[PDB]
Amino acid sequence: AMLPISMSDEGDSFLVKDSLGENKIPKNPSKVVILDLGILDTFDALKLNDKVVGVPAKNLPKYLQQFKNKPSVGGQQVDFEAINALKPDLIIISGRQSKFYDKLKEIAPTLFVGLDNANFLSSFENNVLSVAKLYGLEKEALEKISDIKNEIEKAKSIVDEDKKALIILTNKISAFGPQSRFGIIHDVLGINAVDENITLGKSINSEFILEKNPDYIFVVDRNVILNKERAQGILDNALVAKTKAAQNKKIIYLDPEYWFLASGNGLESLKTMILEIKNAVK
């Protein structure tokens, strides 16, 4: 279980500990470089847009275009020269940039907002509240956290207890299960898994899919972020056509700009993901 972010108020700053280390973070930071797309969406939802001085622009998804003219700090690829030239007072990162921590932390205090795949909602709430604490915005962040909790309960209430889903990432097809990077389908929304026994996932084929006969298949097509080959075609075969999922038109292509980029730290992006699952299975 990932160590949470903890903060103690030391006047004009916080002493902050997270799973990667300790930082002294000034209150109300005014020059923030954000490399996690989810928390960037949370900055927006808390009205902190003007605090942001740098974002991964090569990346930037359709739902974060209010940031497209921020100075770019990379996309996988971090530009440390650009980050240094901004002279930030805070850098914010998530799991994909933990490999860059020591170098980012030479430039400025670096806050990790990791999403624990075994404890998604507690990590999401801690990440959002910790950001908000920096700005004195706890009351606004609690309201919005509540709204997400209410959307989760609405989605959960309509789930068919007797139906099972398979999650896949796509020529390679790989299966994911509970407590994976896509785990919230099973772990938060309570949609049963075809295999509860499954960060790279398990290699599979159309035969595996037919074998399992899922009522739903949730597809995350990583081609879209990169190709001419797409999931609709990898799955366009007579084996996959045999499934309950194909028969009832419940092969559900999820937007990878949410699911693969992993924008679960976002107050509004997480909502959109919940609604996306709910509207597929109701």
Numbering used by the authors: 22 to 96, 98 to 192, 195 to 222, 226 to 253, 255 to 310
Sentences from the paper on this structure:
The periplasmic binding protein (PBP) CeuE1 is an important component of the Fe(III) uptake system in Campylobacter jejuni, a commensal Gram-negative bacterium in the avian gut, but a common source of food poisoning in humans. CeuE, an integral part of the CeuBCDE ABC transporter of C. jejuni, is responsible for capturing Fe(III)-siderophore complexes in the periplasm for delivery to their respective inner membrane transporter. C. jejuni does not itself synthesize siderophores, but capitalizes on their secretion by other bacteria, such as E. coli. Here we report a combined solution and structural study of a series of synthetic tetradentate analogues of the enterobactin-derived bis(2, 3-dihydroxybenzoyl-L-Ser), to explore the ligand-binding promiscuity of CeuE, both wild type and with mutations of the Fe(III) binding residues H227 and Y288.
